[PDB]
From a paper:
VhChiP contains three identical subunits, and in each subunit, the 19-amino acid N-terminal segment serves as a molecular plug (the “N-plug”) that controls the closed/open dynamics of the neighboring pores. VhChiP is a sugar-specific OM porin with the ability to selectively transport a range of chitooligosaccharides, chitohexaose being the most preferred. VhChiP consists of three identical β-barrels, each containing 16 β-strands connected on the extracellular side by eight hydrophilic loops and on the periplasmic side by eight short hydrophobic turns.
The N-plug peptide corresponding to the first nine residues (DGANSDAAK) inside the protein pore was synthesized and added on either cis or trans side of the sample cell partitioned by the lipid bilayer, and its effects on the binding kinetics of sugar–channel interactions were investigated. Under the applied potential of +100 mV in 1 M KCl, 20 mM Hepes, pH 7.4, rare and short-lived blocking events were observed when the truncated channel was exposed to the N-plug peptide at 10 and 40 μM. Strong blocking events at a monomeric level from state O3 (fully open) to O2 (one monomer closure) were observed with 10 μM N-plug peptide added. When chitohexaose was added on the cis and N-plug on the trans side, the K value returned to 255,000 M−1, the value for chitohexaose–WT channel interactions. Titration of chitohexaose into the truncated channel yielded a Kd of 10 ± 0.3 μM and a stoichiometry of 2.8 ± 0.1, while titration of chitohexaose with the truncated VhChiP mixed with the N-plug peptide yielded a Kd of 2.9 ± 0.07 μM and a stoichiometry of 2.3 ± 0.2.
Residue numbers in the entry:
A (entry chain H): 1 to 6
B (entry chain B), C (entry chain E), D (entry chain F), E (entry chain D), F (entry chain A), G (entry chain C): 20 to 350
The structure:
Amino acid sequence: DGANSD
Amino acid sequence: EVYGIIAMQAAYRDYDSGDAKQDDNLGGMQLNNESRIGFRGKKQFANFEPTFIWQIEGGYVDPSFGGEGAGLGERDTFVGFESASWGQVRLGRVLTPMYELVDWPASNPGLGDVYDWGGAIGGAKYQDRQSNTIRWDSPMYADKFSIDAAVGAGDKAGLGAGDDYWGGIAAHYKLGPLQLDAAYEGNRNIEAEGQTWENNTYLVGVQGWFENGISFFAQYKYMEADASNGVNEKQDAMSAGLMYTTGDWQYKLGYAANFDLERDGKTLSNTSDDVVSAQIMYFVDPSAVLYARARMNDFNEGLDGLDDAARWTSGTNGDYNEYSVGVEYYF
Amino acid sequence: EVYGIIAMQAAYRDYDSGDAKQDDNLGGMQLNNESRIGFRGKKQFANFEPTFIWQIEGGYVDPSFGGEGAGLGERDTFVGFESASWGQVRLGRVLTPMYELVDWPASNPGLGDVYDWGGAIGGAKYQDRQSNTIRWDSPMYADKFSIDAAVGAGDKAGLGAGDDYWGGIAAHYKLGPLQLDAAYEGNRNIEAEGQTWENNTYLVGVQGWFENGISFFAQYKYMEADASNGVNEKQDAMSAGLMYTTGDWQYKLGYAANFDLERDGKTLSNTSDDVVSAQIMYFVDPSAVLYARARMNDFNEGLDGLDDAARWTSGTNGDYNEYSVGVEYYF
Amino acid sequence: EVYGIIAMQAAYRDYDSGDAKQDDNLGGMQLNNESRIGFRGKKQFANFEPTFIWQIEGGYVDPSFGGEGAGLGERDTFVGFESASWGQVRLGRVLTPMYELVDWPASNPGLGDVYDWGGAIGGAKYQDRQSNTIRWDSPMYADKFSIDAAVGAGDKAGLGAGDDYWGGIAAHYKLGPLQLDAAYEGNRNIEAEGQTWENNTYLVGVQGWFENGISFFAQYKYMEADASNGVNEKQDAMSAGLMYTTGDWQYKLGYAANFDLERDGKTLSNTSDDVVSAQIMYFVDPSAVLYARARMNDFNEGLDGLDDAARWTSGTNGDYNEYSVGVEYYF
Amino acid sequence: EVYGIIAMQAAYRDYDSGDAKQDDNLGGMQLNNESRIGFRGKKQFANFEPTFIWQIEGGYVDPSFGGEGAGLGERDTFVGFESASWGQVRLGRVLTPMYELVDWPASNPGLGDVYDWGGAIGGAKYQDRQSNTIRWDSPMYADKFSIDAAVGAGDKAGLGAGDDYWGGIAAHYKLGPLQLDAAYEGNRNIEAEGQTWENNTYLVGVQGWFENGISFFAQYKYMEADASNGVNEKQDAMSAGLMYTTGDWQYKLGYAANFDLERDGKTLSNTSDDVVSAQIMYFVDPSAVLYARARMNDFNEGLDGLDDAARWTSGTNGDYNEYSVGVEYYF
Amino acid sequence: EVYGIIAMQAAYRDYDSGDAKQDDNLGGMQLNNESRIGFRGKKQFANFEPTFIWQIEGGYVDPSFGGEGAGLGERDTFVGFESASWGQVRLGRVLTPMYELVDWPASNPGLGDVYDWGGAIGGAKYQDRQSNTIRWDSPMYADKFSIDAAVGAGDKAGLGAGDDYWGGIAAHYKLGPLQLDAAYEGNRNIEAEGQTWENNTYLVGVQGWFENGISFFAQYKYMEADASNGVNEKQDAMSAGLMYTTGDWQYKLGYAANFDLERDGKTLSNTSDDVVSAQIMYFVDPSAVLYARARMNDFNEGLDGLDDAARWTSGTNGDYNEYSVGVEYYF
Amino acid sequence: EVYGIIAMQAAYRDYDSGDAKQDDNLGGMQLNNESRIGFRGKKQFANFEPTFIWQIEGGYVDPSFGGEGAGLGERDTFVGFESASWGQVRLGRVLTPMYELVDWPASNPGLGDVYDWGGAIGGAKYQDRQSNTIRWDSPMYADKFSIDAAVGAGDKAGLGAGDDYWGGIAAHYKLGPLQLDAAYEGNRNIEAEGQTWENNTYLVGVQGWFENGISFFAQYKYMEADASNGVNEKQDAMSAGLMYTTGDWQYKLGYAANFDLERDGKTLSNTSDDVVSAQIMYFVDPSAVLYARARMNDFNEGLDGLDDAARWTSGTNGDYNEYSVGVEYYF
Ligand code: NA
Ligand code: NA
Ligand code: NA
Ligand code: NA
Ligand code: NA
Ligand code: NA
Ligand code: NA
Ligand code: NA
Ligand code: NA
Ligand code: NA
Ligand code: NA
Ligand code: NA
Ligand code: NA
Ligand code: NA
């Protein structure tokens, strides 16, 4: 789970 | 107790970014090692009726596009108390009531680039796993219906660099073989793009598991956002999956999409994403699965934020296809 | 063996720094998750009488004002040998005999901003947890008095980026219900502000525990510092606490202050810090505590270093008060 | 299972780099704390005959020249399958078949500065423990002969920042008291020094253990490299060690050398390094060793790469000698 | 003597306010007749050295957006004394030292909506023409340097409905072809928005006239404001103009802007204004000019005061453009 | 009469397109032979007062990136009539009133890739040299002000494959050492990308020449376009150059940029280009110049048209820098 | 046989068109009398195995917004043949496979203004009831699945004023308590807006009735159209309803929407409709129902067709709400 934002 | 998920994925990605060298760099074969270790325990304090609970989960030990090594605490890490009557509260780093539904069932298989952290809206559509959080999970009242509720500090506030905060709520109703899902999250005081944002996201969804071997999920996601200069932004999304489970095999078809973003009532062209995904899974053991997966990501073409710079999205790196096999083992 | 300290503190910080935006950023509610996991063991080697000991302790998994995730090795992690007559020797990463007394009892409750890493003196007043260290802990001779002694490399030397080094010594003496403590630490070859410093810190203190339930500590700390261009710095500090433990409760009052810094004999005005703190602690279980705490930090008003630039202190960010509740559980 | 190696080395280095300050910074006493914790397991899947294996090993918790703390996943961390019939398959982060012989036996004692990551060739001589790797280790056929074979992505490809990749193979044959060894590695699409390289390394070596207590190893290494603008580099290296083990004692003499690099047929002056090393080891317990070690490193005096800038080597930081004692304990 | 300025402006305004009807009402063709008649005289009293001076100037006889008719006394109207040695003192209705520079040169051509009475700050940035004022004008000492200084009652105090008051000072220094300008004004006891304000405004500026016909001005305006409930406000502004005079023509390009308002350290988004303006002027006679002018005003989009209602600004009515020709005649 | 321009430019291009092979193909040393021969004449008809004029100009005889050889008529080729009273009328193939200003001075030196045919807008921002054209050139009324006016057939209409057409007008005003420039062009019935476009382009600019040897030009370009499916596009551009002329030498700095394109209110990210250019020119003879030139082009990253296919721009081939020396001789 | 539906609806409409009087005319209370009489028969011809069937149904005798009076033949009116083995063929005036699914279940309750004849697409999305139609209805093969297939002349062809025609097919599948619906229709040679169109509509849908009293339907509609001048249009719509039936009561919630129309790749802003509807129905008799219903229609804001004139939609007349009671009786 979680993201990869930037 | 020590626990883990041993999870390995061999993924080949074919990119179409408009830059040759970039296609060569981003694409190729990688190992995506999402294995993680955790420690957790309960404790009945002598002078407190609710039982003490705690967990420390590590991060992915070697994900794709990243270096090796994960620290303890990168994933769900918390303290809390739980009771039979009123459920459990958790303090620390947890999933948002909304995000848990965005991630499972709606981000599997490989729908996350579009539906999880994809999308073009400004501000913060929702959090995904936040530190500085208090979260309440009610029991399954009447073994039919449950509530998840949380408030927490924001990303910048957790560094002493801001005053963002957020609250969220989610509810589920069991109806025979169906599960109805509804969720909301509102983020406040978000500093980004030279503005201060407020976000409001809404989600409705259904899950079904049937004795005939068919199971499905579908979600509709509505995100609004408001900047401090009067600009309003809107984007909608959806995700659905269709599954046939026979014997030791699961056929799964997945589709997810973000639709055109609206800025101040004007539709922005080509700000949409969608992904189509197919997956064959083998229940190799009651505690493990093998799987093969192929997916197609079609991303937006880009958009400017409110600071006259490009706003990052999951499409910035370009459209791509991915073919993968993998293993997941739980202990 | 595996061991852990599960520690969560919900702390509200109210800043009054002279900038309302900065006050909003630094202040607010945060969760300070100081939970850590460690591994340790003993082992009797067949061909060596003194017993082998080792420990590897993890860092705080999610502190306030910081990101999530901590590695193994961030806290006390060492190898060493122990014998009944001559004590234990440890090589690796451990606290210096000086720091261990500044930390306990003198930094509790919430006095650390002033008495731990606070102060305006230049160079390196003392180390805290230090790698590349050898430390000897004497036994409690005659059940009356103990010695702690260590030498080690400095912060820069541990990267091959300096030749700093340090030594320290501390002693404890039991006199009925009182324990007298004295400590020294000298840091050498400290590169800062374009100079090369020598630090020498001296500490004496008393702790008492009485059968009537009152407990107290009091310490006086004296820091001298010498830059390589001839400047001399001196700063005095103090810390004291008074606590009453009755039944399942400990009421605690704490006060600590550093007094105005003296550079080349001139005391610099308004460079003093002090903190007052109140803490209610509840022994919720033999292995855990609950607590609520309030403290007021009034920091120094600023000073320049020897490069005519501002010198960082714990006051750089501004005065603040803190209200907090918390839990700590050991296993 | 949880397993660990508790490994501490106190090592003093006296450098001779041509700069007094540089000699001062890099030299001195340091602790090389290579302790590490790992998790490991097997599992018999219900619907797959070969046993599933996995391991997650943490990194060095506090090595010399580095800060404290290591994550889970930094060392051998993988999933895989094994069968008695065809050996073992491993996916993840493992040693390359070439590197495994370079490291053991040929890099011990303290020969690594020269024979492991030393050398002047351009590109990448071989990888040492690489993520995104699939590796087959065959069983020991006829209790005599084994094969190691692996392919994997390169350093830059593992970040989505390249298309580097590599393949390698190694073989061993046991012949009474001697074992003959051969290894190969080819690295491709290596982007460095403004060019793109192909590397090819070959290794042959012998190990011997005798009933009278003499043991030895000897290795010869040949590395070729070709840039995309036609430049060719070639370099020779060797490694040997001789040991007499009597009772609780192992005496070791070690030697390794790189010879002058040849670029476009031209031998480059002073591109050779060598190390001579002697080590005394004590088997203090079935699970631990104590050791004292001294070694002298004579490094190359410098060379420029194909961008007319200095090419980094293990000699860049200067020649140095090292005296060290240490302990390693396994559990 | 009787004197007048005969000044007529035909202006077409196109508003862009976000409301149709409002664009209809506020916009259109209008005649803005700023003609005014005045009387003034001097008198040398027999028993008093400084010469008595007095003036009574009428208001605009039919400005745009207003009805027709003006009283005698609406503009600069005063008594005073003047001497060659110490300058002149004026009691009555006069411009404040600060305002006079804001108006000229900094509000021409058509820069007034932004730089004259525009801006978002609370309280009262400055007075303009103020009754109940005493103002001293020093002579041009050494034909090089001059002072303007004034104190006066505030808008509410002049009706017996308050105790607001203010003081201000301005200076000019001639440096060859340049004139350096600085001005300050402080208003006190300003009752607005349920609070009591203090404003402090500062100004620096330069003017130049060059022998080839180039002239320019540029000013920087700094506005501070402090409410009695602890709120602090800050806004910066600027104005600049470029001029070429040859023969019977003057070309003028003008720009001015207010920047976003900063409240309690936090910047408010899009509380900035700016105006661009071009004007062509024909010197039709030594006593008159004809002129054509076009300008575009982009105003802030709105903001609330400290009573949570919209705070009126120069933008409240909406952005607009204006094209105008006009005539001015002096006698 | 015969006339010619003998023009040779030796130019090196270094490309950065994202593909090394393409970078190698497009880049390298080339000779750009822009020589052309022409014929022209006047003739006074016996029965027509205005003087008959005609010209036939050949194309570049060997431009870079093209094959050798050019025909008579590829450049300015026309008939027309002249009178001292009403100027000159030309029928045939001429530069459009706008393009003539785009090219000179605004495309020199080497700003043409950005400012001439660069840009992303759909349809046709303007024609450049256009056949099937009628163009009127007014005299310099009052030696101050002139008009250029033209109407003509479109690219497809001149092949009988469409009904595109265009009109354009430009005006120049002398203001001492300045020349004011305003131009407009409208193209209609333009078929592209499956749509039918209308373009409207506007330009304002100023050029100045000063007696001390400084000269400059500055231009601002505004292009809007409307497709038949209702899509509207808007893009801005600018170009400016600064020159110091001393003796036999002219120093030149040039800059031009296109800004991000606007489609239906959406800004398209990274569709802006810009170029900086430096040039030294030698007046080798009253009829010839030598020059050296260096320039850097930063192009847009691509965009799709309204047929969902890539829209060609001068950025299609990739960013590049250019170093060049050249000669031009007029006879 | 004589048969009838006696049906009266009392409906109050409140309009919001932006024009009073327009709101006043369209709004108010009306009676919508959809009562109708029909005659039917079966007949076994002596010399033809399939049974002859025929029907003649009259129209609504007095609908709202229309005059009184209906003839025989305005609704489903046909001759045909039926067989147990292959189903029935009908010639005459019938519902098209597709319209039947749009009308029932998807246009109830009061969803028709949006989902039936609503929509902005040009051409003819589908036919509804059409003359000159032959329609085949398959039997329910295996008590699971049925096929509907029909072809017919178009609206203009039935008056001898055109050559339009159409074909369509629909299929139904029983899956336990669910019915899956899929349908298609294509219209050809459709003359409108000065063009000749082809339309293609696709629909998928699901209906469910469950033993616990809940029933639901959901439909997805995708309409494409292509003009003879090459313009292409696309539009989406959907419809869903939720029903809980307990005893003599039915609660119904209905929602339908058409989404923004896409023309030649451009999204047309505000060309979407949606309606939400609630209905309470009382089963007043085995042959009759009473009902009360409320709905909200929010229609599109307008669009022009391909003749540059407004294209008529159900939104032309304005937004409105409707509150209504009604009765239906069958005999
Ligand atoms: Na990786
Ligand atoms: Na976050
Ligand atoms: Na829950
Ligand atoms: Na904060
Ligand atoms: Na001790
Ligand atoms: Na270290
Ligand atoms: Na590597
Ligand atoms: Na092996
Ligand atoms: Na790659
Ligand atoms: Na006033
Ligand atoms: Na004055
Ligand atoms: Na050529
Ligand atoms: Na053309
Ligand atoms: Na049917």
